[PDB]
Amino acid sequence: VDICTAKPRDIPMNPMCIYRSPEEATNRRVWELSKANSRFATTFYQHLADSKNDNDNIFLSPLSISTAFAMTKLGACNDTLQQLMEVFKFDTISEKTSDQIHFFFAKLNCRLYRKANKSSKLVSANRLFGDKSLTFNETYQDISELVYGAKLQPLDFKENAEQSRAAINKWVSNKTEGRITDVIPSEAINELTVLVLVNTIYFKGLWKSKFSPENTRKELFYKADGESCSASMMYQEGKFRYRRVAEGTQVLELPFKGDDITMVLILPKPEKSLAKVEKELTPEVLQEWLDELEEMMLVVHMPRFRIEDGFSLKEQLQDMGLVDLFSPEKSKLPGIVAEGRDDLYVSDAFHKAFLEVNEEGSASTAVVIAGRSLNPNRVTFKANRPFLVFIREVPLNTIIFMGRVANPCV
Amino acid sequence: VDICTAKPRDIPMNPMCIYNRRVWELSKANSRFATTFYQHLADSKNDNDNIFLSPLSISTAFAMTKLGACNDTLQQLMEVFKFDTISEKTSDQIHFFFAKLNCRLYRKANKSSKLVSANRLFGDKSLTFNETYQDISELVYGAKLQPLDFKENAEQSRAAINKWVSNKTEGRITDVIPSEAINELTVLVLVNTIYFKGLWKSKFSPENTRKELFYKADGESCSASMMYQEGKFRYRRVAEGTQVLELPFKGDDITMVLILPKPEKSLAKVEKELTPEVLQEWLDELEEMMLVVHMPRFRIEDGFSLKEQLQDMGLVDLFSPEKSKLPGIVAEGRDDLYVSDAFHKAFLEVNEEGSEAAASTAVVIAGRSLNPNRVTFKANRPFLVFIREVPLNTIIFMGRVANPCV
Amino acid sequence: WMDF
Amino acid sequence: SEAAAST
Ligand SMILES: CC(=O)N[C@@H]1[C@@H](O)[C@H](O)[C@@H](CO)O[C@@H]1O
Ligand SMILES: CC(=O)N[C@@H]1[C@@H](O)[C@H](O)[C@@H](CO)O[C@@H]1O
Ligand SMILES: CC(=O)N[C@@H]1[C@@H](O)[C@H](O)[C@@H](CO)O[C@@H]1O
Ligand SMILES: CC(=O)N[C@@H]1[C@@H](O)[C@H](O)[C@@H](CO)O[C@@H]1O
Ligand SMILES: CC(=O)N[C@@H]1[C@@H](O)[C@H](O)[C@@H](CO)O[C@@H]1O
Ligand SMILES: CC(=O)N[C@@H]1[C@@H](O)[C@H](O)[C@@H](CO)O[C@@H]1O
Ligand SMILES: CC(=O)N[C@@H]1[C@@H](O)[C@H](O)[C@@H](CO)O[C@H]1O
Ligand SMILES: CC(=O)N[C@@H]1[C@@H](O)[C@H](O)[C@@H](CO)O[C@H]1O
């Protein structure tokens, strides 16, 4: 009995607490949980960017965050349970019970990490690191593994924090082909630390429509602070879903081999600020954008870039309303550690992301286009100023990663 | 007696007048004729028109004609087609090596790709043609002399020739000879034909082939089938961003070479520097590379007179009623012949399976000199093409594809 | 990572 | 593109 083909009655959730939410050719439910996840994405992204200086890059995987906190929700109760449901917009899947969310989440994960005879690799790993001394709830243990594949590995936080820390770090690294390293700095993890919950997500894809390295050239890129810098600009001409939306902003979709996952770029006209577009980027607008796209012939100028980012999510989430989970006095996670211990709370939550974009990904290729003549009045998309980037799974309308490229220069 | 196996000593070349590695030097000679001729031809066309032709064909028809040339005519012929660069002391010896080359091009047990050639002579039925000339031509070029009544049925005769040509070109070359080029005075028509068909050693799948608007230089656009393929190919980006791409046919003995200038860079500059060595240079720098290839599914046809450019390149006597010296052709009848004109017609079709090319050259002795009948159509962003036999260093077909809409 |  | 994250 595996969850990917299962019906809800085949998977008894038996959650300690339950919250009742108020008020195409894909699964209706996993599509709603998708709408939920994206709602969290743009709102969270809006906050994150507003707390950021305009000349800084931003990269993160909102799906990773939602998954990690959904894993945590499994043992949440009362108001900790409600805030989680509201903050992550799971409560917006009308009348559905908080327990149902996890079934849906598992269904969404099954599709996403298909592992079929595909061309792009999208992998995910989750895991629980509990102190060997503690005794975890049998149900929490079971469900975390059934719904999220998260296994529970015993570690010695009490005596060997440093050794435990290296074990975890080694694990994330391995599950991210080495792109996410020392997630846990030598400082954190002590003795008071009883549980380290972790989600990883890894993606690698090749362009369906090639950017020949031979065409890449240094070009000026215009930062928000009015100055310039030298970027490696990739170039090609060909058909791409595109659309010039409000106030001259250009939305472009670059698919990966398999067409299942794409890269979406949002480039405001030179006159307008990305901050202004960030502020107006509503979940419904973004969906509207994405749905109005149409195949077209254009010239593409896109820098090659590598972005590495990391930050604590605590403060951001608190502003959005996730307060109890972080308060040792208000936090209610009675479902996690078996036998009392009511005062378990999240001390901190960290996100670390990596993004590399270029030709061929990982030089040795070229492209020859013979006998082509395009309209001298073709649409051009020149990303030499700040723009937003998204990496999405189209059939599932899932935002896997998002960010902002304020500075691609070295 | 097989000229293909035989020593130069066995085959008695008894031409009237006179003036291994040899095969090779002949191929070089032909290659020089190809590029120089191509340039003159281009200078007479619109940088955006298609141009397709078989230089090998032309070299073959004019060599067949040289069997009966004398004096300056024999000399100008020897120089214009570069046979005079082959290390041989006599004009008559070149023909033996051209025969060897032709042997290697069309007579192999392998036969990965189909490459056939057919020559033939068409002389007026009332004349008595010189016997050795008839003999050497049938021996060296497999060219039999067919009787035709030019004296009382020029039109019937022309239609007869064009059709013979059509049968040797799988119907690809339908009209080598323009309507009024042959008349009551026509003494002889020398003809060459070449037919080729190869399969890509790496074919294109049609699913990957998609329509794409093609913008004509002046005006609007027309649809075009673009083929797509990804794979290892000998390639090379050279000076000024010009790409050289080799597309081998099954067997690897015959390949198509595409030459494309960089975007918004004129092809005319490359053509004006086109030369046998320049080409060898490009060919020598290609390295195997993983690459993506987009290439139109198309067909082009070129037809034209060759007198104008050939005169400009040096062949003047042969076209001069007064000066032409072709004493070896007619023994008794109506002699002191001159070429009234020469025609060529070529055809290239490219698709997912491979390529199909055919050509023909017809030299007309004492007919009505026509008036260069053009068929213009400006296109855009052309690229050069070449269908070569690698082992023999021979340019079979060469051209400029500019209209993929076809 | 999340630190409980 | 190559991307990874951990929360
Ligand atoms: C989610 C869950 O397992 N709840 C059960 C509850 O139904 C039962 O009444 C209690 C004692 O029998 O044990 C557990 O708390
Ligand atoms: C703090 C506490 O445990 N008291 C009650 C508890 O009886 C009830 O079950 C819970 C809802 O699940 O709401 C309250 O928190
Ligand atoms: C008159 C005659 O019939 N003889 C000629 C001979 O003089 C000439 O040298 C030769 C050319 O190779 O052609 C003929 O054989
Ligand atoms: C003008 C002319 O005919 N030049 C000579 C001719 O006199 C000579 O008899 C002949 C012998 O091969 O060679 C050249 O043709
Ligand atoms: C029907 C057909 O195609 N056959 C004809 C054949 O009869 C004729 O003798 C030849 C002349 O070159 O042309 C074609 O081969
Ligand atoms: C039939 C005739 O006119 N005789 C001549 C003769 O000199 C020789 O046989 C030949 C040389 O190639 O030229 C002509 O054939
Ligand atoms: C070991 C323990 O405390 N048992 C509880 C159990 O009473 C409850 O039914 C279940 C629901 O999630 O959670 C377990 O942790
Ligand atoms: C190829 C590579 O470097 N990836 C390795 C993988 O082979 C190995 O299975 C795993 C630990 O077992 O660690 C990964 O980082």
| Domain residue ranges in chain A | 8-206+303-359, 207-302+362-408
Nearest CA to A78 out of A137, A15, A17 is that of: A17
The annotated binding site of B for heparin is made up of 24, 104, 120
Taking the C-alpha atoms of residue B108 and residue B254, their distance in angstroms, rounded to an integer, is 13
Taking the C-alpha atoms of residue B63 and residue B262, their distance in angstroms, rounded to an integer, is 38
Method in brief: X-ray
Handedness of CA B122, B123, B124, B126 (dihedral sign): negative
Taking the C-alpha atoms of residue A88 and residue B308, their distance in angstroms, rounded to an integer, is 81
Q: C-alpha angle with apex B155: B151 to B156, nearest 5 degrees?
A: 85
SS3 A244: strand
Taking the C-alpha atoms of residue B116 and residue B123, their distance in angstroms, rounded to an integer, is 24
Taking the C-alpha atoms of residue B205 and residue A79, their distance in angstroms, rounded to an integer, is 60
Supply φ then ψ for residue A371, to 5 degrees: 70, 35
For chain C, the residue count is 4
Q: Which atom of ligand 5 is nearest to the CA of B168?
A: 12
Taking the C-alpha atoms of residue A386 and residue A389, their distance in angstroms, rounded to an integer, is 10
> B218 CA distance to ligand 5 centroid (A)?
43
Taking the C-alpha atoms of residue A373 and residue B379, their distance in angstroms, rounded to an integer, is 9
Taking the C-alpha atoms of residue A303 and residue A218, their distance in angstroms, rounded to an integer, is 9
Q: Is A349 on the interface with D (CB under 8 A)?
A: yes
Interrupted backbone of chain A, residues before each interruption (C–N > 2.5 Å): 23, 362
Taking the C-alpha atoms of residue B47 and residue B380, their distance in angstroms, rounded to an integer, is 8
Supply φ then ψ for residue B152, to 5 degrees: -120, 0
What residues contact A216, with CB distance under 8 A and at least 6 apart? A232, A233, A234, A235, A304, A359
Q: Which CATH class is domain A207-302+362-408?
A: mainly beta
What residues contact B78, with CB distance under 8 A and at least 6 apart? B19, B66, B84, B91, B94
Locate tokens 């119907």: which residue?
B171
Query: Largest Cα–Cα distance in chain D?
Result: 20
What residues contact A226, with CB distance under 8 A and at least 6 apart? none
Residues in contact with ligand 2 by the CB-under-6-Å rule are A 17, 77-78
Nearest CA to A334 out of B265, B142, C4 is that of: C4
Taking the C-alpha atoms of residue B381 and residue B379, their distance in angstroms, rounded to an integer, is 7
The annotated binding site of B is made up of 24, 104, 120
Supply φ then ψ for residue B227, to 5 degrees: -100, 150
DSSP A344: -
> B200-295+358-405 — its CATH code?
2.30.39.10
| Token couple for A268 | 């405001």
Handedness of CA B101, B106, B107, B111 (dihedral sign): positive
Residues on chain A touching C4 (C-beta within 8 angstroms)? 193-197, 333, 336, 344-347
> B8-199+296-352 — its CATH code?
3.30.497.10
Q: Is D5 on the interface with C (CB under 8 A)?
A: no
Taking the C-alpha atoms of residue B89 and residue D4, their distance in angstroms, rounded to an integer, is 75
Judged on CB neighbours under 10 Å (0-12, 13-18, 19+), B130 is buried
Q: Are the C-beta atoms of residues B238 and B257 closer than 8 Å to each other?
A: no
> A172 CA distance to ligand 8 centroid (A)?
11
Beta partners for A201?
A124, D5
SS3 B385: strand
Q: Which atom of ligand 7 is nearest to the CA of A140?
A: 12
Taking the C-alpha atoms of residue B121 and residue B363, their distance in angstroms, rounded to an integer, is 10
Amino acid at B160: A
Residue A18 CA: which ligand is closest? 2
Taking the C-alpha atoms of residue B70 and residue B324, their distance in angstroms, rounded to an integer, is 8
Q: Are the C-beta atoms of residues A361 and D1 closer than 8 Å to each other?
A: yes
Q: Is B294–A214 a contact, with Cβ atoms under 8 angstroms apart?
A: no
Supply φ then ψ for residue A288, to 5 degrees: -55, -55
Question: Distance of CA A296 to CAs A9, A211, A291, Å?
Answer: 47, 17, 15
Q: How many CB atoms lie within 10 A of CB B17?
A: 17
Q: How many CB atoms lie within 10 A of CB A206?
A: 16
DSSP A164: H
Residue of A nearest to C4 (CA): A346
Q: Is C2–D7 a contact, with Cβ atoms under 8 angstroms apart?
A: yes
Q: Distance between the two ends of chain C, CA-based, in angstroms?
A: 10
**The CA-based dihedral angle spanning residues B389, B393, B394, B400, taken in that order and rounded to the nearest 10 degrees:** 80
Q: Are strands A195-204 and D2-6 parallel, antiparallel or unpaired?
A: antiparallel
How close, in Å, is residue A223 to chain C by CA atoms? 32
Q: Are the C-beta atoms of residues B262 and B242 closer than 8 Å to each other?
A: yes
For A245-320, list the strands marked E by DSSP.
250-255, 261-267, 294-303, 305-312
A8-206+303-359: which CATH architecture?
Answer: 2-Layer Sandwich (3.30)
Supply φ then ψ for residue B70, to 5 degrees: -150, 165
SS3 A249: coil
**Alpha-helix residue ranges (DSSP H) falling in B261-354:** 268-271, 276-285, 307-312
Taking the C-alpha atoms of residue B147 and residue B154, their distance in angstroms, rounded to an integer, is 12
Taking the C-alpha atoms of residue B356 and residue B377, their distance in angstroms, rounded to an integer, is 22
SS3 B197: strand
